Subunit: 257 residues, 6 copies
């Protein structure tokens, strides 16, 4: 029972996340006590390889609390997706989804072939972490239903195709990364440029009209509340390293003042 997937598909309340960039088992376990709905282990812009991902998923699970792990893969390469699923990640985020075919392919990589999903490309291996090392031979009958797919729309081409992307069966969430979108649209460093705001609004309306959840990365709490008020549901409230630096610098300023 992938509860994050259930809430994305069947809820209307926001789901608050933290980005995990530090690659620290202790930081992941500590933050599994922070009360967030989800936590993202980034492989794309943080140096988390397969063993780091399995270690951090273990550290989160060890807290025995409700936060759902998400893994952002570095790319839509079959072997990389295979590693994250085998490690036990049940919600994956794919960067640079530009076309409906990119999105369909991402979804196929997460699906065991079934009548449910005819053309699936997910590989079978019964001794991996995800199959409790062989102790759930029932694994293969349920897994397809519990794997969530989040696609990142971060380019002009992807925004133009976003309605087709959102209509792809198996796309559970569209995710907006404002800084990459802004750069890609010719507006490096300026996420509130009207071209960028127009593109983000279009992703949000497309999700709403397709009945597909929309997520977004927020750099701070003020922006996160704006995105909530606007209708985004999967809201990242910035990142571990960013909070660590803000908080320790603020404390120092206070003592010195």
């Amino acid at each position: 029972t992938n509860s994050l997937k259930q809430r994305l598909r069947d809820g209307d309340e926001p789901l608050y996340g933290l980005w995990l960039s530090l690659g620290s088992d202790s930081a992941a376990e500590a933050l599994a006590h922070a009360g967030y709905d989800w936590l993202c282990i980034d492989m794309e812009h943080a140096p988390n390889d397969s063993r780091d991902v399995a270690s951090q998923l273990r550290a989160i699970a060890a807290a025995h609390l409700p936060s759902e792990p998400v893994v952002r893969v570095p790319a839509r390469e079959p072997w990389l997706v295979k590693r994250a699923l085998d490690a036990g990640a049940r919600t994956l985020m794919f960067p640079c989804i530009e076309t409906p075919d990119d999105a369909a392919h991402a979804v196929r990589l997460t699906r065991f072939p079934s009548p449910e999903s005819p053309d699936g490309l997910r590989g079978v291996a019964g001794m991996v972490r995800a199959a409790a090392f062989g102790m759930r031979r029932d694994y293969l009958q349920t897994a397809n239903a519990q794997v969530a797919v989040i696609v990142q729309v971060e380019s002009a081409r992807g925004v133009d195709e976003v309605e087709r992307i959102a209509a792809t069966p198996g796309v559970d969430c569209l995710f907006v990364g404002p800084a990459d979108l802004a750069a890609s649209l010719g507006h490096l460093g300026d996420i509130r440029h009207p071209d960028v705001e127009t593109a983000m609004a279009r992703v949000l309306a497309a999700g709403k009209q397709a009945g597909v959840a929309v997520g977004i990365f927020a750099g701070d709490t003020a922006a996160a509340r704006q995105y909530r008020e606007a209708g985004y549901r999967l809201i990242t409230v910035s990142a571990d390293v960013s909070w660590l630096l803000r908080a320790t610098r603020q404390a120092l300023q206070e003592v010195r003042s």
Copy 2:
């Protein structure tokens, strides 16, 4: 001398192996004492990256016993095959081999360009582990003769094309993973389904006809024995973690009965 390569070519005797899924140096070393003809460090469905492969190869080698290491690479990407070979793996298994072009390419990646292999794609670097850090002077002239290539046939297309794949120069062994093949054929988790069994029978017959050893992954000793009687040669007797779990759970129920 790669003795697994030599016995795959000249022998009729079966060659028994064990799958190493745990990623543990200690388990690899211990199991190097177990009497197996070969041991497989899996990079596809276990989280073994280049340093993990080098550490397990050292751990097996440290035992000073006859077990031949096999490395299954995550995918047919040049850079990955390059890492495996440089680390000193001399018998490589390729997943997802579907066409004779795929098989030819796998072989090309493992060969330095020579008159015997004019289209070899293996990159030259003299200081790597495989060259004893520069101490094996004649490394470039002796390497190609000691590399073995095992191609895994795991799709309907691979099975369709299996006669052409087996005829490919350089292919030392055809490897059947019944679980993957059953998924691919629309019988997820049902390796006993008769279309699965016909597909496996066809790969085996292809090998006998080509004079190419056939390998297979067995989940239990009964199946391993069936395969041996059928003519499979390179037989995996399940996986480290599967034996570890069976034996510890059986011992517990014996004690407590």
Copy 3:
């Protein structure tokens, strides 16, 4: 919240079955957390498990969300090593080489915060460690002592002579026999069935029974484990991960070849 291994050791009469973890592997620990054992022992004395390895194996076992209770055997009775294991969240500790009731009492002190029930406690206070949920268990200090269990390994001839007084040491929750080291210290290296070794072991078990303190033992095989169960040992180790791995893989090879 509750160390169920401690509670069962002190309150129950039933056997508690364990497996020794020597391989130092997170995946192996997580896999074995599905094997049904009452406890699993991460060994720091005779396996190369240092503090980060202990924490990573604890996490790996906890991640299975199943009932096995981890036990840590520390390398030696040094304050800094005991601190490392407790801070990492191990709540049941095994101490090697306990030979006198002073040794046993010291081992206990090292596991206790100074408090009314343990005024001589020597455990160092740090609120941000893994054992305190990184600061989130705000009453960690007031509630930790009650959940820490101490197992003393009795494995020498002096220890056997002192075993009734070791058993009566407050805070000793289990007496553990390692027959291999016991046989070696009594002059019978490699011979755990020498009658003098069997006599020593019988004494330790009897001391436990008379004191109402659980006795444990490392069994090298299943026949042994059953003999020990029948004799009244409670905390019974059914050999070790690496031993089962070798035995089962070697057995499978023979079967396939026969």
Copy 4:
């Protein structure tokens, strides 16, 4: 080149603000090296940092090329552990559980090459280690002793009783109060504001003022750190990395939800 923490501890009157590093993270260490603190503490006592973690965290802090001075709290006053910290390039060491002037003097000796100014120095020579730039720092044997700072933690009743004599030990550069352990040791586990604890902490602070030795303290929050600064403490820890991370993220979640 110059240990500026030692320099300012000896020569200056200003507070020197620090942060505890308990996460054991290279990236967290490098990031925090950009935060403006005077010092950063890699804890080996109450966090799982062994020798290679200390080296990699030292390297991470150094790679920022900024003023923060690393401090390493050793697990215990054992010669081999002190050696590991010094060889890795830690130039300011903190020693837990210092209770007697002899304990203090021993800690100092472990950090000193035997030399005219330190005839009983016990630091071991090994010219190939990181601290000696692998042999490239040719004046290392002449320059090292003067750049090593020794901080002694006073955190027991006995230590407080001897604090004036500890403070007078040559080579003691700072007396550091851990209020949590000191409170426990005085029978007030969990209550650092009890009057008996306050009196003990004030005695440590007076002892340093009187000896001309800087005094340090661990603060749980900024209001307490400011009270300490006003009282005359100089080496003031502004809580821990993990503490700030948890507080910040939890406060952020409530803001977003409210």
Copy 5:
């Protein structure tokens, strides 16, 4: 702290001497940072250096506070791998097997943020990575591109044939010859002195001179390195860490035994 390798590559005739780092060792890397080389290459293609190793070796070199410029050879021109190396702080990248001007242009684009100076840039943005001082370098997006340098390896017949156009690609700071790979590719495996190979090499060198683009090369020994310096190559690798280690320890044994 400007990229001085890019600066010196863009200008003048001076040789720039380097060492290949294959051992994958933080300690070796920091030690070699003291050896006086202009640059040091962390190889990901033919040594087992993954993202965390690259970051750890970059930290280790940085910790020495000395002038050597790190270079990272990526395993392939796959966007995710290039992203990893840039986010880890690598400012000079070497790309293997560049064969066409389109390959070279693509390699360059992967390293640049999209900006007025580079409107076709494809480098992706993440503000919290090590290259951005984890968000503390406020002007990073506007200053990064100017300090990133690109070395393209020419090691195939096809690359040789296109070399003048590769050289003309904006953003190619250096054409690097690997003779071993080139010789293999030209059907002369193991024989870098065959005249077909020397011709090919001479052509790459003439192309760079004519264009004012620095040419680099791997030398296996000092005789070779000198021959290449005299011929006009600027970015000269003086063999590899492991090769010098083996050579020196083997010759020292011979001297002590003779």
Copy 6:
């Protein structure tokens, strides 16, 4: 099955040349296993090698399948540290800081299982450790002692004063001189050629010869190693991995720039 270093130390007259491994690198260890040395020292005292690093480097050396014998210098004479090094499969141990014949005997005891041959052995028993081929060596306990060798380091005035009695201690296979630590301890830091230091060294060397015990020494260069061989030292270290790496790479640079 034969510790050839132990046999040659006890029965040979030939020199036994070694190399100090301080880099902590598996690849460097395996490469150096090809360089032709009699012995290779994995240092745990003055390099950051903990138990897993020792096992990794032992594997890496063994993987070469060549004749070099590994030696491990333990950090200290502590039962748990010795257990870790022996259990890992090290068969020759060097102990630092041996000052008295009681020290030396204790060290020997720590390496021996209690057998008829060594009834006072203190080595704790474990049958499934790497040294026991994970339990495949079913007579490991009964046969391990005969292949375990002990090297004691003499590095203080007290040790030199007691060197005749140390050398007479059963089970001491080699007296090892570290000139740098000896010099420091005798009041001559950095001055290994002072007459006091040369006089002490001569006495250690004479004591070994008289007793029929091999004498070892650490040499910083080949000319010193040659002098020591001429004086009658047998177990001769030809400096360290990192020192050769730096000398060789720096020499290469000099030769290319000249």
